[PDB]
Symmetry: C2
Amino acid sequence: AHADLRINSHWIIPIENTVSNILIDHCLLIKDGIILAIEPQSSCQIPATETLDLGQQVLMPGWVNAHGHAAMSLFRGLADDLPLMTWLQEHVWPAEAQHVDEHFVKQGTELAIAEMIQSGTTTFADMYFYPQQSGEAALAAGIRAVCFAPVLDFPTNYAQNADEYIRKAIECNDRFNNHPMNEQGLVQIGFGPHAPYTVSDEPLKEITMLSDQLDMPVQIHLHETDFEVSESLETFNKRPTQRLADIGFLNERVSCVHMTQVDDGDIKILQKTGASIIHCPESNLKLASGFCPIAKLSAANIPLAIGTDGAASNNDLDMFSETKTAALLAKGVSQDASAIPAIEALTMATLGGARALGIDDITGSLKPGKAADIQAIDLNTLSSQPVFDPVSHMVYCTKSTQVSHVWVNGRCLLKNGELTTLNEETLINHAKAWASAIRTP
Amino acid sequence: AHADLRINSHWIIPIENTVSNILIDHCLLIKDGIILAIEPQSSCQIPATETLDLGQQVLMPGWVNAHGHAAMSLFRGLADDLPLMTWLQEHVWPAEAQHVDEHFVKQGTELAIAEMIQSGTTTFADMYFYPQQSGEAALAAGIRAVCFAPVLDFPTNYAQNADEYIRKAIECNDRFNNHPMNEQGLVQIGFGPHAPYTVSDEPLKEITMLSDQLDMPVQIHLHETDFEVSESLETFNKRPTQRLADIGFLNERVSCVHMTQVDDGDIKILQKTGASIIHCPESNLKLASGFCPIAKLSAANIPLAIGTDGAASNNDLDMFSETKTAALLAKGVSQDASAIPAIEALTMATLGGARALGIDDITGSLKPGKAADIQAIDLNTLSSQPVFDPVSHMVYCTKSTQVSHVWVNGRCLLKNGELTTLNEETLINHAKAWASAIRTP
Ligand SMILES: [Ca+2]
Ligand SMILES: [Ca+2]
Ligand SMILES: [Ca+2]
Ligand SMILES: [Ca+2]
């Protein structure tokens, strides 16, 4: 048959229309990992090799988790309820210096990926050590990934200095351009300078040039805390946004994480440079970083996305919960019950992330021609019934465990709630082994 | 055997110690619905008729959902993303006037109860029409309930005026004191005056007298919105807290819901009168009501509890998610990452609710002599591994679907994730029937 797979579902939320936000009794037709068409089930005349009848479920794009540190799944809830400073100095940094190597990153990324697939995520962004390990795990699992190879001014086990961080990013990009398993381009490598206060101007400019030459996305923290903004004003006499804008670092391919400290000048700079904002509400709350004013940013037409951050400051990788927090918090922050309606929250969590990571041409919404990165959510459960508008249900009363199926590039990674490329029992054993090693070395 | 049931579990979080917040390899012994003892498994010499081996699970008190409207499960996500005023006038109130009767409340409460049990809740507070229907559903399900019979100044189908609302509350209390199925006292009736701006001084004073004479708890909204506080200042020249204090309405048996508008005078009044505060973070965010400063309230030793509110402004009844929101939001609001640590969030969500509803003598913590209201949470799942401190995991990375077992008064209401006194498929059919009736009458 022309189509590999036909999926029938009562509801489809395409995110991009091709003027209601939802389609009733349509089907998706997929071929070679690509969406061929979305059409009414009754009218459809495209035969399919295989057909799946989902019934009372919602099909929508898989989530794009636009900021994370996948391998830190192995530090899940390592040290909760402590100030950023104690958390970092007495727990996270020693644990990183002692435990994080290629094996840690491999097993941690596998664990994260399995959690993410089970909660409907089809693309993750990763900013962490040993990105080749992370990228390789993504390849074996079949999940789409953007690994923002870290760049820092300071030495770690992974690299001694900015130039070495950059070298390894270039090497990793080259390795994935040429990897036998990566012909489909599921894994992209980018540059992940941590933050303006940990990376100097020179490496940042190198990143800009290299990012352009090698077609790589860039991610950086921006205005995460009042402290970082004050520090920048003391040291550079500029807000970080201004510093980055003045050296030409900010542009469309850059995503700026957090942005809890926002003034009108920041917004103008963001509008000018075309950069995206990645919202991480739960992590911002948990660490007391502040309140990203996504309502205000949205009204200013700033591109917005959503990330969970890492499992040591969340502590899960559940985009259903993160998107719900984003939609609820925004109404409180803006004092406006109509701010960030459900369709907008879903859009941030899918197409917004795709745009932020530079991959919206291929994924992030259900449009003919885009990749078949799809999640199916089963609504026939007590906590989801009755349903009046499935779009708002997705955001306000859906558990991630309702995800029944997941496809990436048209490949089934989750079938009736069960992982198809990862072994849950094995991953859990490895997690427990690492916990013991971390707990009592 | 002396004990009816022995439950073995790797972790027990008793909430009240009898100085670590958790017990390793202990067991719970239950007899006649009562906790006989909590002892090390190895040392235990109390035989039991039946023994359950749970392994890597946490036993803790079932949640006390201290404010809700159970039957509004049938309005789940009725009209999302609208301002309080449109929400009420164009959606909720017409739907209530048209659909809410004894049959609505029966089937809605059953649906809510099933959702709540599946997410580990063992006591719910309800403030809604036809409390006898709600109470009767609680009795048949086996869940503990406090039904705060509504009192209002204005006419509804349920009652024409304050005196009639009060009459029906008295009748309902009497009916449950004498109900053949209620000998164990699972169901308590209370008074639920909606808010200072919908109930006059006279009925409020009657409630105080009757509450005392009949040993009934009282629940009221207090300082939910800036509008209500301003309105009270115009009309009475007092903050609502002051109005209620001056007529002697506030006392230990009263729970005050929301409290997003707080000044130092409010706190003093609350400290003086001994009343409890019920925190409903997601509903407050969703409707843009404001930010209850639970960190500040906690530091002032004000008794605190947690509620989900109703399914039209949440939109689920999941106390795992609500407690996590409470713990996270509080750090952001107070700008203090150490504020409302996990053990304190759990305590609010269990013992805090018990105290608020006047039932802490019998439930809310795992102490010898208290009721066996218990939930078991399975940690052997991908998203919960690894685990370093189960207490903080409960709050920061646990899904409600991890609840494997639930007991109320030592009766199993949920066995391996399956309801034992309610039929899930039936409830869902009824929910869909009501949705159709509500959607297209
Ligand atoms: Ca981060
Ligand atoms: Ca989370
Ligand atoms: Ca309410
Ligand atoms: Ca909720």
